[PDB]
Structure 1
Amino acid sequence: YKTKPTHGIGKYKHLIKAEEPVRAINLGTDYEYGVLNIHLTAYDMTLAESYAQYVHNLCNSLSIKVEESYAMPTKTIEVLQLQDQGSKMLLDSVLTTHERVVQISGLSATFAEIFLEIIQSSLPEGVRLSVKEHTEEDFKGRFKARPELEELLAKLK
């Protein structure tokens, strides 16, 4: 009750973040880093997924806030070779490239060196490690294209 000393003993919403029914890119301070993206690029989907899972688990164990864990569309490229004694490049093979992205934030300036050293030492063979700053350009590129919007913009031009 309001007049009793045991007032507000059942409060729970102050212990829980607001239940909201895109996202501003946080920028780190002088001793912190902003929202970063680690997009491992590999020709082996299994290796890429395994290393992304390892990075996510390592960040969770090291108490680094992982904003997201997703993947970029697979890039399919036909590799052709010129035939011997001929002038036609036949289809030698077809390769697929995958890009597993882990979006993290709150990396400390001092611990950044250690984290980068660990994730570059644990990098498997055939996998390229690429750590960059999260950008609205990348966020929009994650989405599809809108040819109708492009045509309307060209008409406006």
Structure 2
Amino acid sequence: DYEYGVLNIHLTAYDMSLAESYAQYVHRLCNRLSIKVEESYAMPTKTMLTTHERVVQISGLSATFAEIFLEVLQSNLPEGVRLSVREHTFKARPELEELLAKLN
């Protein structure tokens, strides 16, 4: 019994608009499914014309949940969008102040 690592998704598509929507769209599914999404970063343009890719940081997953979720992604996948799933690779005043007490 182990907990899945955080796996990012790079939604590579010709048009960012469609890519963003799917990213936003799948994120809505993620939030409903109780999947935490830390970031929605995106890659730059693929200069040669160009394409567009959207990062989707998916964090937290389970074995039974993994099987259903990824298959759902295939169906959700909109027109001409290339999926990807990969394992992932300034603190403010309250955070630092709390940190001082812990190690003091």
Deviation at 1:45, TM superposition (A): 1.3
Identity within the alignment, %? 91
Task: Check conservation: 1:43, 1:95, Cα contact below 8 A.
Answer: no
Q: How far is 1:67 from its partner?
A: 1.7
List per-residue Cα deviations over 1:16-61 (Å, max 9, x = no partner): xxxxxxxxxxxxxx44210110111011111101100001111011
SS at match of 1:58: helix
**Alignment TM-score, normalising by the size of structure 1:** 0.54
Q: 1:145, 1:74 → 2: CA distance?
A: 32
C-alpha RMSD over aligned residues: 7.9
Q: Deviations for 1:70-109, whole angstroms, at most 9, x for unmatched residues?
A: 1111112xxxxxxxxxxxxxxxxx8321110110111111
Going from structure 1 to structure 2, the CA distance change for 1:50 and 1:156 (only over 3 Å counts) comes to same
Q: Report how far residue 149 of structure 1 moved.
A: 30
TM-score normalized with structure 2 length? 0.79
Output aligned runs, 1:90-129, within 5 Å: 95-129=49-83
- Structure with higher helix content: 2
CA distance in 1, matches of 2:4, 2:24: 22
More relative contact order, 1 or 2 (CA 8 Å, 6+ apart): 2
Distance change in 2, residues 1:49/1:149 (3 Å): same
Q: Which residue of 1 aligns with 2:18?
A: 47
Compared CA separation, residues 63 and 96, structure 1 to 2 (3 A): same
The number of residue pairs the alignment matches comes to 104
Unpaired segments of 5 or more residues in structure 2?
Answer: none
Which protein shows a greater Rg?
1
**1:74 to 1:110, Cα distance in 2 relative to 1, 3 A:** same
Q: Which runs of 4+ in 1 moved over 4 A?
A: 143-157
Q: Which consecutive unaligned segments of at least 5 residues does structure 1 have?
A: 1-29, 77-93, 136-142
